[PDB]
Amino acid sequence: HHSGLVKMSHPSGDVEACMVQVTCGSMTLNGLWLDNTVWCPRHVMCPADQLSDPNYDALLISMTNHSFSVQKHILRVVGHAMQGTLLKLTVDVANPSTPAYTFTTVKPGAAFSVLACYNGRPTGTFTVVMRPNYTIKGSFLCGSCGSVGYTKEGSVINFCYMHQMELANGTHTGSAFDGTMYGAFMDKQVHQVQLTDKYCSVNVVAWLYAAILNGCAWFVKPNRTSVVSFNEWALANQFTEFVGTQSVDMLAVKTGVAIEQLLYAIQQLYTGFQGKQILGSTMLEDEFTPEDVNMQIM
Amino acid sequence: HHSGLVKMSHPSGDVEACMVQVTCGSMTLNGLWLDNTVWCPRHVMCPADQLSDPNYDALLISMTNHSFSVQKHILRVVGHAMQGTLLKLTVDVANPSTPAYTFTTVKPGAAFSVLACYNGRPTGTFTVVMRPNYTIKGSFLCGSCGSVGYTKEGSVINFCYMHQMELANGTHTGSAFDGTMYGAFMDKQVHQVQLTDKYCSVNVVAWLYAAILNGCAWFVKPNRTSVVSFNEWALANQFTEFVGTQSVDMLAVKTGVAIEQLLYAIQQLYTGFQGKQILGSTMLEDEFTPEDVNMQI
Ligand SMILES: *[C@H](O)[C@H](C[C@@H]1CCNC1=O)NC(=O)[C@H](CC(C)C)NC(=O)OC1(CC)COCOC1
Ligand SMILES: *[C@H](O)[C@H](C[C@@H]1CCNC1=O)NC(=O)[C@H](CC(C)C)NC(=O)OC1(CC)COCOC1
C-alpha cells in the first residue's frame, strides 16, 4: 500500500516575487528583495581572482552605492551594509509583493523548501533537511548563490537559508539571515571538510510512525528504551539526541505506540531489516519530519 | 559524492494564481480559473449519498448556474457544461493573471509538477511520474480533488492533470483537461483493476548516466544489448519499451558511454547489484528523466 509520504515543498509564489539579480563588477548572483532591503551573499563583491582569501572588510569599504546593480526579471541602491556573510542593500522602492516574514535559523533535522534561482529567475523548488553536520543535499549549480530556503506557518514565511557554497562531497551550505554561515564554514574558495553526519533520531521515529499508520508494524515490540537511555546510546552510535515535540506526541496518541518502543526498535533496526522492508525501504529514513507525517498521513 | 540529483518541481506561483474553491451544495473542492473558465471535477455535483454509481448526466441537468459557488482565496457562475470527467464553469470575471498555457496529455515515464490544494488554498508542491499503469503516487487527502498537474516549456504552462481519486492501493489518478481520465478509470467509488507497474526503461538509463557522470561506473562494460533485443527482453520482465531521444543522446556524449552498454547493464542489475550500490541505492530507479539529469548535472 502506497503511504503517500513524499518530498513536498511549500508553494513558491510568495518567494518568487522577491527574487532579484544582483551584480557587482563581474560577479552576478541572486538576491532577496524584502520591503526596501535586498539580501545577497557578500562574495558577490569578490572578483574570481581573489576568491580564495577575500578581504571582505576592505572590499565593502571600496564600494559605493553604484557598485551594486539590482535587476528584477520575474532598482536603485541607496545604502549598503555587511552583516556576517551577507550584504544588506537598501533600495529606493519597497517590494510591493513582500510576504509577512521572519528570520529564524533552523536546527538540524528540520526541513525547508528551497527556490533554486539563476540570474534572478526561479527555475525549480525542492525540500531539504538541515543535516547534523550543517549541510544540505539538493541541487545547486553555478549561478545559484543567493537562492533562498524557507518554511511557511500561517501567512508567515520564515526565511532560513541563503545559498553560498558546495563542498567537496557535493553537499551544500549557506547563511541564515542573521548572517551566520550554517556550520561556520567560511565563504572562501578553499577546501573545507564537513564534520561526520548523523541519523536524525526524531525523524526516524516519525517515519516509523508513518509506517505503523500505513499498516506496517512488524517491527513493533513491547520492549522499550527510555529517552534518556537512548540519548546516551545515540552519542556513541551516530544518532542525534531525541527531543520530543507535540508533533511526535500526536503520532504516539494516534497509533497507540509509545516513543520508547520505537527508540528500542531503532536500536535493533539500524543494522538492517533482516530481509524485511519498511515503507519500501531496507534502511532507516530520516528526512521526513514529525510534521511531514502528521500533515501527509493524517 | 552526493550527485545533486533530486526530486525537483517547477516554481508554482503562476499556477497558484489560478486556484479557486468550487462548491456545489454540500461538496467542496478545487478548481482552475483560466480566462472566463473554471475547471473542476464533475463529482463536485455528487452528494455523499450516491458516490458509488452517480448519474452525472442527470446531476448536470438538475443543476443551474446558481447551484455552483466559486471563491478565490489565494465569482459568479453564468454557464455550466460537462466535458468528460470535468465541469467547465463560465464565470463573469476573466482571470487577469492567466499565464500562457496549453493543455497536454502526459505519457508514462514523463514527470510533472503537482500543486496540491485544499479549499482553494495551495498547500504543497511535489513532482510525480505518470506510471506505465496510468497512475501516480504523490500525496492527496480528502479535499485535494481539483489539484492540478503541469509541465513547462519556457514560460508556457502545460496543464496535464486534474486530481480525481485515490485507488484501493493508495495510488492516485486524475483527468487530462480534455476530460479523459488517465488509464480510463471511472470517477466512481468502485473497485477497479489496475495494471501492474513497470520500470520506465528510458528513465533507468538516464539514472545510470547520472551515476556515470557522478563517477559511479562499475556496472559499465563494453558488452552491449541492442534496443530491439532489449525491448523483446523487457516484455517478459516488467520493463517499458526503450525509445531513444535527443535528451538521452546528449548524456551518451557527455559520458561517452553508449546506450546499448546501459541496456546490457540493466538486464544484469535487474538480477541484482551483487553487493554494490548505485547512487546510494540497491534497486533500479526509474523516476528521474533524461531531462532531469541533463538539467541537474
Ligand atoms: C555561488 O553560485 C556558488 C554555488 C556553487 C557552485 C557550484 N555549486 C554550488 O553550489 N558558490 C561558490 O562557487 C563558492 C564561492 C566561495 C564561497 C567564495 N565556492 C564553491 O562552492 O566551492 C567549490 C568547491 C570547493 C564548489 O564546486 C565548484 O568548485 C568550487
Ligand atoms: C477528492 O478530493 C477526493 C480525493 C481522494 C480522497 C482521499 N485521497 C484522494 O486522493 N476523491 C474522492 O473522494 C473519490 C470520489 C469518486 C471518484 C466519486 N473517491 C476516492 O478517491 O476513492 C476512495 C475509495 C475507492 C479511495 O479510498 C478512500 O475512499 C475513497
Author numbering:
A (entry chain B): -1 to 72, 78 to 301
B (entry chain A): -1 to 72, 78 to 300
What does the published report state?
Coronavirus 3CLpro is a cysteine protease that has two N-terminal domains containing two β-barrel chymotrypsin-like folds. The polyproteins are processed by a 3C-like protease [3CLpro or main protease (MPro)] (11 cleavage sites) and a papain-like protease (PLpro) (3 cleavage sites), resulting in 16 mature nonstructural proteins, including an RNA-dependent RNA polymerase (RdRp).
In the current study, a new dipeptidyl series focusing on the design of structural variants in the cap substructure were synthesized and evaluated for their activity against coronavirus 3CLpro.
